[PDB]
Amino acid sequence: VVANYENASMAADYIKRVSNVLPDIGIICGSGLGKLIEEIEERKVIPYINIPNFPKTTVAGHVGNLVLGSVGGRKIVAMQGRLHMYEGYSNQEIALPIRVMKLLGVRVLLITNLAGGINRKLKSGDFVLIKGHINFPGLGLNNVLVGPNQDEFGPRFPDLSNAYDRLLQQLALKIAQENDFQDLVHEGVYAFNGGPTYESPDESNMLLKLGCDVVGMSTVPEVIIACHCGIKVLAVSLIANNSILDAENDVSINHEKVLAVAEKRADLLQMWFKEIITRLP
Amino acid sequence: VVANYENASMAADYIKRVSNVLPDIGIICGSGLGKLIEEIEERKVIPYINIPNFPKTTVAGHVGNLVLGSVGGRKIVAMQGRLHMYEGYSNQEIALPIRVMKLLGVRVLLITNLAGGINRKLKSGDFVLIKGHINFPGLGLNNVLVGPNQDEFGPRFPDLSNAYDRLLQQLALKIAQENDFQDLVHEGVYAFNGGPTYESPDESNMLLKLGCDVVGMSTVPEVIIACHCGIKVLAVSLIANNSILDAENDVSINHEKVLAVAEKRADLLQMWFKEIITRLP
Amino acid sequence: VVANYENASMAADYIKRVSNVLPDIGIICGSGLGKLIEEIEERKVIPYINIPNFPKTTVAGHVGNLVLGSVGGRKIVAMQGRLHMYEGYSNQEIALPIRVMKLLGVRVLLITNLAGGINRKLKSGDFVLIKGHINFPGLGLNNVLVGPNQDEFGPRFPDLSNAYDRLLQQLALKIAQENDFQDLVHEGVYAFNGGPTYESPDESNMLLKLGCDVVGMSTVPEVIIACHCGIKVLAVSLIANNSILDAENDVSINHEKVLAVAEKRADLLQMWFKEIITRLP
Numbered sequence: 065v066v067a068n069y070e071n072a073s074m075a076a077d078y079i080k081r082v083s084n085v086l087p088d089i090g091i092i093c094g095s096g097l098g099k100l101i102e103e104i105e106e107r108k109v110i111p112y113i114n115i116p117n118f119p120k121t122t123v124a125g126h127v128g129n130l131v132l133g134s135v136g137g138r139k140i141v142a143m144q145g146r147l148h149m150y151e152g153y154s155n156q157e158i159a160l161p162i163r164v165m166k167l168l169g170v171r172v173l174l175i176t177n178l179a180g181g182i183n184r185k186l187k188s189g190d191f192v193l194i195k196g197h198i199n200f201p202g203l204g205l206n207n208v209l210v211g212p213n214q215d216e217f218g219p220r221f222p223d224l225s226n227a228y229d230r231l232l233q234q235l236a237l238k239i240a241q242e243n244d245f246q247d248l249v250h251e252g253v254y255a256f257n258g259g260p261t262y263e264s265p266d267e268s269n270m271l272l273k274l275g276c277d278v279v280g281m282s283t284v285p286e287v288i289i290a291c292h293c294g295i296k297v298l299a300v301s302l303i304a305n306n307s308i309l310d311a312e313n314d315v316s317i318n319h320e321k322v323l324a325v326a327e328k329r330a331d332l333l334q335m336w337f338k339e340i341i342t343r344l345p
Numbered sequence: 346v347v348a349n350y351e352n353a354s355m356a357a358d359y360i361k362r363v364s365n366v367l368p369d370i371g372i373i374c375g376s377g378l379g380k381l382i383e384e385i386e387e388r389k390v391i392p393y394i395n396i397p398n399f400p401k402t403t404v405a406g407h408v409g410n411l412v413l414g415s416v417g418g419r420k421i422v423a424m425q426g427r428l429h430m431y432e433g434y435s436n437q438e439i440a441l442p443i444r445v446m447k448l449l450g451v452r453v454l455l456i457t458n459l460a461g462g463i464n465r466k467l468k469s470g471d472f473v474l475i476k477g478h479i480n481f482p483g484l485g486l487n488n489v490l491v492g493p494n495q496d497e498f499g500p501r502f503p504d505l506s507n508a509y510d511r512l513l514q515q516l517a518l519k520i521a522q523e524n525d526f527q528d529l530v531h532e533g534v535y536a537f538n539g540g541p542t543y544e545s546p547d548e549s550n551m552l553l554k555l556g557c558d559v560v561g562m563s564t565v566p567e568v569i570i571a572c573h574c575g576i577k578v579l580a581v582s583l584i585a586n587n588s589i590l591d592a593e594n595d596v597s598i599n600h601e602k603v604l605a606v607a608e609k610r611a612d613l614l615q616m617w618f619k620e621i622i623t624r625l626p
Numbered sequence: 627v628v629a630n631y632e633n634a635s636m637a638a639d640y641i642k643r644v645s646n647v648l649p650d651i652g653i654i655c656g657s658g659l660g661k662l663i664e665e666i667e668e669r670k671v672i673p674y675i676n677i678p679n680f681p682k683t684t685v686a687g688h689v690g691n692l693v694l695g696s697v698g699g700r701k702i703v704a705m706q707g708r709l710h711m712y713e714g715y716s717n718q719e720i721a722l723p724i725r726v727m728k729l730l731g732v733r734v735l736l737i738t739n740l741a742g743g744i745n746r747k748l749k750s751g752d753f754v755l756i757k758g759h760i761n762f763p764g765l766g767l768n769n770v771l772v773g774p775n776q777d778e779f780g781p782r783f784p785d786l787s788n789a790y791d792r793l794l795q796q797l798a799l800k801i802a803q804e805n806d807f808q809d810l811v812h813e814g815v816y817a818f819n820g821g822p823t824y825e826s827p828d829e830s831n832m833l834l835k836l837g838c839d840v841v842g843m844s845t846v847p848e849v850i851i852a853c854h855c856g857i858k859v860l861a862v863s864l865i866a867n868n869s870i871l872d873a874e875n876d877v878s879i880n881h882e883k884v885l886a887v888a889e890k891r892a893d894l895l896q897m898w899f900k901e902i903i904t905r906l907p
């Protein structure tokens with residue numbers, strides 16, 4: 065199923081019939097960082113498998129719902145269960161849920177992820193406001209837009225120089241200052257590793273030389289589809305470890321240690337993003 | 346349809362029946378840089394869709410013709426409507442038209458493209474004679490030769506160290522000197538970005554560190570198929586912008602600005618390549 | 627055919643019925659470096675094409691056998707005819723033979739390859755003990771583990787920091803010292819170029835800047851599948867040329883020169899790996 069105008073429209077039609085919510089904000093939450101979705105008010109939970117033309121996700125299993133409702137007086141739509149390209153999903157499967165968001169009325173997309181630190185000033189537990197990216201799949205002929213262009217959504221050759229909205233970064237930092245946790249908040253360049261193996265010690269050393277501050281396996285595909293169709297983006301990484309320090313000390317990373325960092329920062333990230341949603345212009 | 350000896354032969358048979366031209370020069374012209382094709386003498390226009398085993402191009406649409414005839418007393422074949430890998434074409438679809446050129450008798454392939462400047466001495470409107478490349482799709486398992494080797498055309502493991510003929514570069518520069526526009530002509534290393542998103546500001550900064558002079562989304566696949574089967578190559582980029590300066594000044598690139606640069610330099614590029622064809626040994 | 631638990635089990639069942647050997651060591655030998663397989667004792671040769679669920683290899687042709695028997699009193703299984711990703715094999719086709727090795731009882735995998743030298747201290751004829759890697763296909767969304775995870779074999783997100791066993795490197799070097807050829811033995815970081823074109827002169831210059839010591843077109847996929855399922859690895863490159871010196875002197879590489887280096891070092895590599903097998907803990 066192609067992520068075209070007709071197919072996205074049929075999914076949006078179903079959603080509008082069931083939910084009655086007209087959202088102008090979308091959210092995609094990272095691994096262990098989804099608590100906010102359980103606090104959406106007057107909410108409606110729609111399993112992906114019920115929505116016409118949504119991608120099949122049963123091989124990977126686990127949760128996959130679209131959730132609509134209100135936060136801070138604002139109308140939102142959330143993806144509960146993100147699609148990752150290391151699972152084997154195609155370009156068309158990644159793009160269709162974002163283009164449905166567009167047809168539903170979304171103008172701002174807020175994204176979180178868990179990532180590895182490269183810049184030496186980053187520690188486990190820090191947040192990074194993403195200000196640009198290095199898209200290794202894109203350079204290597206696996207960009208999320210490879211294929212026919214869907215002209216109704218956007219141009220054949222997008223410019224990404226303003227993909228990460230500057231005023232949204234400034235609002236996120238302002239709220240951290242108001243609540244006295246700005247000492248945790250950095251800005252940086254995100255490198256997209258297709259995955260699913262963690263960056264090796266020598267890949268980490270290479271990324272340091274190339275000007276990368278953070279590395280992870282998500283986010284850049286969704287940012288590109290959003291920018292292509294005119295949706296503004298804020299993207300924030302939670303740092304699980306510093307991979308350069310780990311290479312110097314021969315220390316390993318693993319999914320269990322990552323998720324313990326997520327649990328440590330989940331409630332603060334929930335409070336931060338609730339206020340960001342409330343304060344959006 | 347595989348780009349094998351049998352299938353390429355059937356396409357060449359059709360072409361020979363219709364055109365009567367036996368070319369020894371091939372040309373592939375970049376976006377907005379095709380005016381020379383409209384001035385081929387005693388010419389024959391063959392739509393791709395009529396040629397057995399040529400790739401289907403109707404999803405992308407727009408022009409797609411093979412044009413045979415004479416320029417400067419020399420017999421040539423031109424591709425009018427280039428195939429780009431960001432459209433989703435396979436390795437086999439890109440390679441078959443070049444291998445048909447080989448079977449028709451082509452010994453020299455002349456290529457132009459529109460590209461972004463990385464080296465600080467490059468301005469909008471400059472030309473770059475390409476002397477080597479950095480093939481990010483190739484390093485990343487998307488080389489145009491991934492698949493079975495077609496032994497009749499070339500070896501399993503090609504050497505690319507002489508892919509860009511030195512004497513052809515010298516002839517191009519000599520002609521620019523004769524017509525007093527050598528101040529526009531540089532040489533440089535071409536980085537292949539699969540695309541279709543323009544290089545981001547941080548990708549541009551990375552490419553500067555890695556020794557790239559120019560970046561674009563074409564040309565390297567055709568060069569590799571030509572080198573594999575023994576065809577000599579001249580490749581010239583027209584620079585639309587300097588992406589490093591643009592990142593420093595927060596200025597955007599877009600397809601409209603690119604095509605205005607193409608129109609500005611089209612007639613000079615036409616005159617240059619007409620003389621190159623006339624003067625080839 | 628997916629490289630899952632059921633399918634790997636059916637291949638292992640066939641092999642156990644035919645060979646009676648229960649190996650705990652596996653070997654994969656590089657191009658022109660397979661002489662040791664012809665000296666396996668009380669051996670059993672099983673063509674890939676006879677084994678249920680093994681990948682089809684007739685388009686590429688040439689030898690493809692699994693060979694079981696004894697070396698130095700140890701029980702081994704060898705792949706005679708390696709599968710390379712530049713031939714077009716899928717992730718699932720590369721992984722299934724390694725996962726069959728796991729089910730048969732393999733705990734240690736020994737690998738050799740032919741590679742190009744980047745570090746300036748490497749000469750034609752030198753050996754490199756691989757201590758880490760830079761996986762350009764992996765960064766670019768062509769990692770061998772892209773797809774559903776097969777949970778019975780290993781975790782969704784592997785850590786590769788100990789993929790190249792340190793004690794096995796130390797044993798290999800000790801044996802070289804005992805036989806007075808340690809002057810040929812280096813250690814280094816291996817860059818994976820998907821291929822099949824040799825690294826270009828400008829790609830070589832880039833790899834030097836990025837901390838790569840050696841470059842080649844194999845080995846990293848098998849290492850990752852082995853590490854994922856808990857198999858220890860020793861990987862050794864034989865250097866055919868120095869690509870940085872060749873770029874400075876405008877000298878070419880080709881398959882014929884490569885194989886002459888292989889013949890020059892084949893008998894020493896055979897003796898070295900026989901002793902390594904004998905001495906494994």
Ligand SMILES: Cc1ccnc(O)c1
Nearest residue numbers: 178179180280281304
């Ligand atoms: C959380 C973690 C840290 C390391 N690298 C990633 O891709 C993810």
Ligand SMILES: Cc1ccnc(O)c1
Nearest residue numbers: 459460461561562585
């Ligand atoms: C003409 C243009 C300039 C920027 N980058 C490209 O790929 C193309």
Ligand SMILES: Cc1ccnc(O)c1
Nearest residue numbers: 740741742842843866
């Ligand atoms: C043997 C050789 C030397 C150059 N590069 C490779 O991939 C292989």
